Design a protein around this ligand. Structure first.
Ligand SMILES: [Mg+2]
Length: 492
């Protein structure tokens, strides 16, 4: 029927999965099928150097396995996985991520703090009512993002090391009477020092609405509703859209600071966070106070909802600008069960690489661009290892399934031997295709070509949005490019 998609984000306290189905009309909307949270607590599995321990890698692979099983249990297919502060900052993040893909198939792709905030803002957009001027705080276990925007997307994003877990360990609590109050005071000072040079970007102006996301905000909104006389957030469906004030926050924080850590776990609504909630609430209070906020609204949408919005946008955008013939290839590719988001990205990068080669003086026949696009859309159709003549279809088949030593040996019956000009074409287009499939090996959709220059008798490709795994793939798959176009160096 309609397209099913799985996305997941690996954070510092927990990991989150969203499985959803697109909405007919190519509008960019989805219907939630399933959501799942895993308490990977990666921020508790770092060493003194910030490296993720083997126990952290066991916790990460466990959650992604559960995620990949729930996605397959719904037909969602490949899970797109972004990773935020804990992996971003671990010196062994890349090796951990490649190890976890070996064990699960899913690769935790590290995104930047600025991109994290942008995608989080889009997820907030899907859950709550944004006005013309919105400031959003997203407190995780590792970092705190500030995002300012209007009714559709983020304009400004700032990411600071003020995570609830980071702050709890940064300011260890004593056993005195005011030990808690002292932790809250010193965390408030850390927030001010780091936020001061940028607070103007996010300060309240007349008409500004403030929004909070993630589990600290959701727990705090539940504790404040239960203090004012309320049932747990399970009645009323959740905390989404709940509003609280800076005074009620400060009051809850004052209560938490007077309580010892095991007493914090028995504060209603904080049951699952008794160990970080003191420093977390201090962060939220100091940050909002520095910005001049008086009231906030809590959002249950976050990173994973923004990932689904962006993915659907890229897919439907690709489909819209495509010819009807190429659209039938996509539909066919869909009926074969290929990942359309991966297919769209490989075709876009294939086109960008092809276009710059042409600008630099590479000669290609007239249908070459069309054949590259269709083989790019179909490269991962196992059943094949409308608008096209029988020649073009064999060209496309041979581009999609290219290999040095062809499985059918040349002397073996049914061997398909294309005329020489067509053999030279298939190899050249297949070299572009391999490089492009390398650039989306991690299924991020974020790789972009910046520049493709001749370098001696070779080439120099500049690229962004690329994980370490995508860069490694281009090295493994660019041998054919180097055998047809000259050696290729990648950068950035
Ligand atoms: Mg591929």
């Amino acid at each position: 029927s309609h397209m099913r998609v799985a996305v997941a984000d690996v954070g510092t306290n927990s990991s989150h999965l969203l499985i959803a189905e697109a909405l007919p009309g190519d509008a960019g909307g989805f219907r939630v099928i399933d959501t799942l949270k895993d308490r990977t607590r990666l921020g508790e599995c770092l060493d003194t150097r910030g490296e993720l321990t083997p126990e952290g890698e066991e916790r990460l692979a466990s959650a992604l396995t559960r995620f990949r099983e729930l996605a397959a249990s719904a037909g969602a297919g490949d899970v797109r996985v972004y990773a935020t502060s804990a992996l971003r900052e671990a010196p062994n993040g890349a090796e951990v991520a490649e190890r976890v893909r070996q064990r699960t198939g899913l690769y935790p792709a590290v995104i930047s703090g600025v991109r994290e905030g942008e995608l989080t803002y889009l997820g907030v957009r899907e859950a709550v009512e944004l006005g013309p001027d919105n400031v959003l705080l997203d407190l995780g276990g590792g970092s705190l993002e500030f995002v300012r925007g209007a009714e559709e997307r983020a304009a400004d994003v700032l990411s600071l090391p003020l995570g609830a877990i980071r702050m709890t360990r940064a300011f260890p609590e004593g056993d005195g009477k005011n030990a808690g109050r002292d932790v809250a005071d010193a965390v408030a000072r850390q927030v001010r020092e780091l936020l001061r040079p940028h607070a103007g970007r996010f300060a309240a102006r007349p008409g500004t609405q403030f929004f909070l996301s993630s589990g600290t905000a959701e727990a705090a909104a539940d504790a404040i509703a239960q203090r004012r006389g309320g049932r747990p957030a399970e009645a009323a469906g959740g905390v989404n859209g709940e509003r609280f004030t800076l005074t009620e926050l400060a009051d809850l924080l004052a209560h938490v600071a007077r309580l010892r850590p095991a007493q914090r776990a028995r504060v209603p609504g904080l049951e699952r966070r008794g160990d970080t909630i003191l420093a977390a609430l201090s962060v939220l209070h100091a940050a909002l106070d520095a910005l001049g906020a008086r009231e906030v609204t809590v959002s249950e949408g976050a990173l994973r909802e923004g990932m689904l919005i962006e993915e659907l946008a890229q897919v439907q955008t690709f489909s819209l600008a495509l010819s009807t013939r190429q659209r039938s290839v996509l539909a066919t590719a869909g009926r074969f069960g290929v990942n359309l988001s991966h297919a769209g990205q490989v075709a876009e990068l294939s086109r960008e690489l092809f276009d710059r080669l042409l600008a630099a003086g590479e000669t290609f026949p007239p249908p070459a661009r069309s054949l590259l696009t269709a083989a790019a859309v179909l490269h991962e159709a196992g059943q094949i290892v409308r608008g096209f003549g029988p020649q073009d279809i064999e060209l496309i088949a041979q581009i999609a399934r290219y290999h040095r030593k062809s499985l059918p040996k040349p002397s073996h019956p049914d061997y398909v031997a294309l005329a020489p000009a067509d053999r030279a074409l298939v190899a050249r287009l297949a070299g572009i295709l391999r490089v492009a499939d390398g650039l989306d090996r991690a299924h991020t959709g974020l790789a972009r070509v910046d520049d493709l220059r001749r370098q001696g008798q070779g080439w120099q490709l500049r690229v962004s949005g690329v994980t370490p795994l995508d860069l490694a793939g281009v090295g493994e798959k660019g041998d054919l490019w180097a055998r047809e176009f000259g050696p290729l160096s990648v950068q950035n």
